[PDB]
From Swiss-Prot, chain A:
This is Large ribosomal subunit protein uL3. One of its GO terms (molecular function) is structural constituent of ribosome. Belongs to the universal ribosomal protein uL3 family. The keyword RNA-binding applies.
Length: 206, 142, 7
RNA sequence: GCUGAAAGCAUCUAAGCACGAAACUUGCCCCGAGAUGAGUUCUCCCUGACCCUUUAAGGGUCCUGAAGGAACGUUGAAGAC
RNA sequence: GAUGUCGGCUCAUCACAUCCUGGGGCUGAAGUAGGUCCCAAGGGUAUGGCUGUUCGCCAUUUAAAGUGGUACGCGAGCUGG
RNA sequence: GUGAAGAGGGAAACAACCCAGACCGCCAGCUAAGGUCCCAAAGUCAUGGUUAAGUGGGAAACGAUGUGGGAAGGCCCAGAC
RNA sequence: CCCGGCGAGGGGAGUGAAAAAGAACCUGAAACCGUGUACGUACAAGCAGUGGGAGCACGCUUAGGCGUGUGACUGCGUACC
């Protein structure tokens, strides 16, 4: 079904009763609110529009003010969309909590990766470094050949921006769901740095 | 005096509607290009668009001979090393039947800013409905 | 002259 | 392979019909409306006075200057610029 | 009135006459394990000792350690035995 | 014989092949090779046949109840195959 | 006389037939670099032209529909020695 939007608060260690340490990626999934409910008669696909968080009064734009005021829902920090699986129904102004993930046992998180900036072939494509001595001339961490005896094929692995892109990790085990704190304990690591917004949706890969 | 030459600023262009169901691919599109190019008009001019807009319906019901419905391949490239992807006549109708006529015309028309402008006067629809009646279209038994 | 350019 | 004639029988085939692999099309992930065929939904803002003129998708003046954007600044787990 | 040559390093890429994995037919296929032929190029496809070597032999592995084209791929990318 | 020293039209493009020998000019026409659905000027032209493989539009020995046509022959209301 | 750093370099005045002669000085070409105006130009592929040719601008024109410049689109077209 649908997912939710939260914040990467960080990572901590969870000790069970048998003395095992389960890595977790805590997420502050604030109470979400629906903004739009779209159908096929107008748009052409069953989905919803959800926001979260808050924003300053004298900083948000007027166009969005009416977009949020239309549904009588306080402004958020962004907007996202979730497709419905032919069996989901919602209404504007409806608030969604973290309990939605109570009986799922697995999710696929999504978020933006960290920013490495301009990266090299080694940092980026795990290229094999050349000889550091024994003759090498200014060609230690260089790629080498990029073709044959007359064009560089498209998709050629080269240096460039590394990170700051959409990334989706799949099949992450859930550990705990504390609605009192609006938290979600996801096992393992997830993209993005502390404070970045990320999506959490049930796992399709089982 | 200098031979007549048409001017696109004051030349007439009419609208027509067609149903290709049961029609053969080449023997049909051959007449399309002939019309979007203007070779059926007395004011024909190679460097001008003296054609007539056309709206063909039921593109998913064309007719073909032999096993072309299965053997006819539609190759194309993406600009990569693998690149080449093939699709049989059936795989196109089920996924995108409009491109069949859109492609047959592309090979019958001139290659240039003009031949591409003729295409723009071509409108295809897989079904029998359309929202172009406001243009007062006409019938064509081709 | 000496081998490859210009050893 | 079933059925089954041509060819009284037989036959997986010619008409029809059912199985069939990490290939191909899908489904998983990312880019993605410069898709010039340039798409779709919601919301927000502007409701002046005239002149002249090849009298038109015309030009110019006075008043008006929103929504929003940009610039500037403090900066970033963003970044060569 | 100049197209710089083996091999190594690096980065690869396509073909299929398939090394492995996958799907099958006959088998002098009991089984296990093989042989032969067909379909299949999706991905994957050793490290070291001697030698400048490719190759090759040897040791030990691996499901397998494929055959070839690309100026016997690649020196305005390195090396220079 | 052409090219070299020869343009032009055709063969998709292609000095040597096919047609044909450019004094200059015209928005005149008839022809050659070669062609006449579209890109692309001209027959979706007429008659009677063949092919089902896109053969046409790359290829041998050799194999094959493919298929049309042609002349016989053997056995057939003593019942044949 | 004025700007300017009691500058360089300029602007007026003035001399002179000439200052469009400022001594970087008769005449003052081209390559090359610029300002202004008209037209074209951000879905369009290749010796950048040629033939045809829309539209725009200006000058004619006793509106005569011509000429000048621009050249969307279109056929053919791979520099010279
Ligand atoms: C004592 C010096 C050895 C001597 C070199 C002579 C010489 O004059 N070399 C200069 C290189 C010229 C080049 C690289 C010219 C390129 O524009 C074309 C070449 F690539 C073509 C090509 N060359 C080769 C094969 O094919 C070829 O054999 N050589 C090229 C590198 C040297 C080698 C050669 O000629 O060596 C001689 C040996 C044999 C006595």
């Amino acid at each position: 079904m649908i997912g939710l939007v939260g914040k990467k608060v960080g990572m901590t260690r969870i000790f069970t009763e048998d003395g095992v340490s389960i890595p977790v990626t805590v997420i502050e999934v604030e109470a979400n609110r629906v903004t739009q409910v779209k159908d096929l008669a107008n748009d052409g696909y069953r989905a919803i529009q959800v926001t979260t968080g808050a924003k300053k009064a004298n900083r948000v734009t007027k166009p969005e003010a009416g977009h949020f005021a239309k549904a009588g829902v306080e402004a958020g920090r962004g907007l996202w969309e979730f497709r419905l699986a032919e069996g989901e129904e919602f209404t504007v102004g409806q608030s969604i909590s973290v309990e939605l993930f109570a009986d799922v046992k697995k999710v696929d998180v999504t978020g933006t990766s960290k920013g490495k900036g301009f990266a090299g072939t080694v940092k980026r494509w795990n290229f094999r470094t050349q000889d550091a001595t024994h003759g090498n001339s200014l060609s230690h961490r260089v790629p080498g050949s990029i073709g044959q005896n007359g064009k560089v094929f498209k998709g050629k692995k080269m240096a460039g921006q590394m990170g700051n892109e959409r990334v989706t990790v799949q099949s992450l085990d859930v550990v705990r769901v504390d609605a009192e704190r609006n938290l979600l304990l996801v096992k393992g690591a997830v993209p993005g740095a502390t404070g970045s917004d990320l999506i959490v949706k049930p796992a399709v890969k089982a | 005096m200098k031979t007549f030459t048409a001017k696109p600023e004051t030349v007439k262009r009419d609208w027509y509607v067609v149903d290709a169901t049961g029609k053969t691919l080449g023997r049909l599109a051959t007449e399309l290009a002939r019309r979007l190019r203007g070779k059926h008009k007395a004011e024909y001019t190679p460097h001008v668009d003296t054609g007539d807009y056309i709206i063909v319906l039921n593109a998913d019901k064309v007719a073909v001979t032999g096993n072309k419905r299965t053997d006819k391949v539609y190759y194309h490239h993406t600009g990569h090393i693998g690149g080449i992807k093939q699709a049989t006549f059936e795989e196109m109708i089920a996924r995108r039947p409009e491109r069949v006529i859109e492609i047959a015309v592309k090979g019958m028309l001139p290659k240039g800013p003009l031949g591409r402008a003729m295409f723009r006067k071509l409108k295809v629809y897989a079904g029998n409905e359309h929202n172009h009646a406001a243009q007062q279209p006409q019938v064509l038994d081709i | 002259x000496t081998x490859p350019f210009x050893x």
